[PDB]
């Protein structure tokens with residue numbers, strides 16, 4: 001089946017090349033980065049709803065949910081936030097992140113700590129510290145539902161998903177690397193949500209059973 005595939009922009013391509021298959025002592029920070037993004041997406045739609053309540057549509061509840069899949073060996077971070085359009089997935093996010101991507105790359109070449117990735121506005125990419133593939137399913141009010149996917153080899157796919165569960169928001173599926181399986185464990189995820197994301201202004205829903 002024909003899948004639309006794109007080459008990442010120079011700076012992102014170089015940043016992902018840096019992140020993958022590298023030792024780091026605090027790879028657990030990926031969770032804080034994805035939850036903060038989800039909190040921000042929820043805040044954007046909450047803000048839009050203050051002027052136009054119709055923006056909430058059939059999904060009036062704002063949540064952040066963490067789903068470990070012990071059979072598929074995946075960790076999912078899903079929210080009912082603003083979501084992303086096709087143009088966001090393909091170009092717009094990379095355009096706004098460009099300067100910060102180049103600046104973080106420069107900090108990393110200088111011995112910079114990977115934990116400050118979020119201050120550079122490219123925190124999503126920390127998912128590649130623990131995953132070898134990331135699938136991103138997103139539905140924004142202004143577009144159809146789309147699936148973005150990448151194994152950080154320089155390319156990414158973008159496919160329309162006109163049959164996904166999502167009324168609005170983003171679902172990030174982390175296909176965990178063989179040695180990063182600890183992020184599927186209930187205690188680890190509880191301790192991790194508590195350690196770095198305790199006072200997030202939305203419940204961090206952890207699928208326990």
Ligand SMILES: COc1c(C)cnc(Cn2cnc3c(Cl)nc(N)nc32)c1C
Pocket residue numbers: 037038041079081082083084089093124136148170
């Ligand atoms: C598609 O994959 C992404 C890319 C290539 C860059 N940044 C983000 C972070 N990000 C940007 N907007 C986002 C929204 Cl609306 N929501 C969430 N959860 N993450 C977001 C994502 C998920």
